[PDB]
Amino acid sequence: LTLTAATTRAQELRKQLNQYSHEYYVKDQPSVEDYVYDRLYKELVDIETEFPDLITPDSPTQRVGGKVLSGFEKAPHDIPMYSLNDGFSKEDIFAFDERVRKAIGKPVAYCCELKIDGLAISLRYENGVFVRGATRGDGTVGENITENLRTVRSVPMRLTEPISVEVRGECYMPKQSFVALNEEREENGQDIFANPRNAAAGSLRQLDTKIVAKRNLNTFLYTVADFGPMKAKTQFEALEELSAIGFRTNPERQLCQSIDEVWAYIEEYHEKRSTLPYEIDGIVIKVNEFALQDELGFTVKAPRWAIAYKFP
Template sequence: MESIKKRIEDLRKEIEYHNYRYYVLDDPQISDFEYDKMLKELEKLEKQHPEFYDENSPTQRVGGVPLKEFKQVRHNIPMLSLQDVFSFEELRDWDRRVKGEVEAEYVVELKIDGLSVCLAYENGVLKTAATRGDGIIGEDVTLNVRTIKSVPLKIGYPYALEVRGEVYMPKDAFEKLNIQREEMEQPTFANPRNAAAGSLRQLDSSITAERKLDIFIFNVQRIEGKSFEKHSEALEFLKSLGFKVSPERIVCKNIDEVIENIEKLSQIRGELPFEIDGIVVKVNELNYREILGQTAKTPRWAVAYKFPAEKKKTKVKDIIVQVGRTGAITPTALLEPVRIAGSTVSRATLHNEDYIRQKDIRIGDSVIIQKAGEIIPEVVEVVFEDRDGDEVIFKMPSKCPECGGDVVREEGEAALRCTNISCPAQLKRSIIHFASRDAMNIEGLGPQIINLLMENNLIHDAADLYYLKFEDIVNLERMGKKSAQNLIDAIERSKGNDIDKFIFGLGIRYIGSKAAKNLAKYFKKIDNLLKSSYEELIQVEEIGDKMAQSIISFFKEEHNKNLIEKFKNAGINFELLEKEDNKNKIFEGLTFVLTGSLSRYTRKEAESIIESLGGKVSSSVSKKTNYVLAGEDAGSKLKKAQELQIKIISENEFEDMIRGVV
């Protein structure tokens, strides 16, 4: 038994060493095959010998049990934000203010575009990881941070240590995630920062583990048993402990050297594997920081120089159209390739016909493009003086480019739509949507497998999935026995989903996951929903005229009726599942409205918490509203709540309510 324990400990040490080489130093010493072999051996031994379980084992970085909500963490040292400057003149003004107090040297660092966190270690073990929050109180995201492989779970320092870092999503991981979300017809992230923030704040840490996040540590917040004279020394100490510290750390004697290095770093910005949105300049001497002090929100000893948005000129070679799941036909500009903000851009979405007309974009035009949020290409303007008369005015098609069906533009809408419900492009995307996580969540059924099944004429609609047999798919390319059986099992499991998942999966226009839940609660059976009238539908919470008409039109369509019958015959659950619910329904009978940007929750997370505690979330403020949860930049809803004298609560008050304080 001792030999097994020793083998487990040796494997853990060796795997962590190779994690450090790969994720921190970017200098792997073994192949992926060798690494995977060691990890599998460790997983097998730990499974056979649970008595040797260790929460800090490298096998435990895959995510744990989903949380109901994030706990609050009060920071020992406030996590301040930085003052932004947008020109060298402003930077010199800041330098003059510093030099009026102390004769300091500076450290120049890259400003990683991510989400700030504080990691706290005790006795050499990671205890908590918290988001910045409002700078005083953050969210406990320890389980999620543990999935980031460049974060050391153990360090060779036995005293209390707190460090601050920036969690980010590398460019290649961001691009892959957005491609995946596009294929699933899910909203894409605007930039890597939003993607990182959304990924780190998942209540299910296994989702975070899939998102390939990384981190750079850029400051010692608090340390016992040791002191430093300079910030640069502290970073070197952290590096020696195995932290992935802030890259491109440059000590500068004066502001001229700072500006010189900012100009150099701005030139390599596009070549970096992660996004930066500026350069941070800090006073290096730690005792000078105490002299300079801070305002309520920002330190006086540091500043962030922000880069201006990069723009480039290129030419529109052609404009093509693509057909989405709902039949929407979206125009896309094919561009002469141009390098901008670190990648080569060869296409940009033009959204719809109105967008093209408003900007007067023509085939052959020279245009100025930039990356919205530093990542998504968009056409800013046309260079009209470059026109020579050969430019071609683009016309949206009168027939669907995929199936030749009629296209229409409905009143009040900007998009053209294909009216053929059997359009191959719509069919493929509707099946992708049906299998997606928020719908039927059929694990392993991604766009490539759906393509494979359609190309082999095994499925023609989503219902056909439930008639697949093991022998139909086992010999397909990229399948094999295990993959085939896993897919069949996943499809079978999805039959038992609650009906809101099925309703959302049908892809009825205007019906999102929340509306699907409301319909499921009200009608309780799919058959009841099928027979529902307009008058009944508008009685359902948040189902308005347009949504009701869309539901009626969907179920009137003969093809859709046949599809529903096909699902029913396949054994899909068609009734609301009765769930045993012992939760404290403290929000029973209360209606909330959310407005503004919440710092501790995504909108969806806040809604889930309210609903899990028995409350309802409405999209509009009325006399029936009990509370308005207001974040930053709250707009017209806040004003209406004030007019109606409805109770307005902050995030702190909301969390007090959750804990039963109010």
């Protein structure tokens, strides 16, 4: 296989393998059987081994990691990563809804999402290419964990469209991976992780990307910070649009027209809670219309258009 034949074949394989990987990791719905992916994967690895100069950032062989950093660099957030006000009872929720109605002057629809137990991260894309990944940190400055995020399978290295955007989401570790990880630590005489959140956070502080690639972390994107060319005028639309451009979003989302539908939603998943492959510790209620979120604005620490109902 010449260099010219390999240069061309590599792009075809990356193109196809990344599509398969998208259906598998992002949609949780693989089209082909693993052995189909494996052969093609092995074929690209042969080509990459023959011509290491054909290796690209979006090549699926990169998910295994390799870089070891001396430490993390500061990662300023152009747009703040605010906190969330909390509600602990049915009353707190209706109390919040009344304040929202008092400020807006009419009933408002809420986009409801599960409060994923993990670590909030920000992703930056230039012309569809993944260029930066950062932890939330203190809200205005986090850590630059770009190299580690490259190993998180559901994080696209190249979007379905060459657009430039900044999105924020939750990076977590599924219950079963959490369980196996602790057994592994127990076997090695290490201290186990108290919960999945700590397992995720601790994994993302790891400097050896080879290790982080094995931590089996996943993601759920919940917001667009810098829209770029994106349309979306409501949170519900933002979530569908995050999915359209190639991000992993949470299927359990729901748009509720009333505060009563929101409570029914809370109760619904309050039961289903234990049946999810990941831990949640509540529900995040968001004023759907961006025009309305803008009206409500933010307090000094959190938006006045959202509240997180924390489970008891």
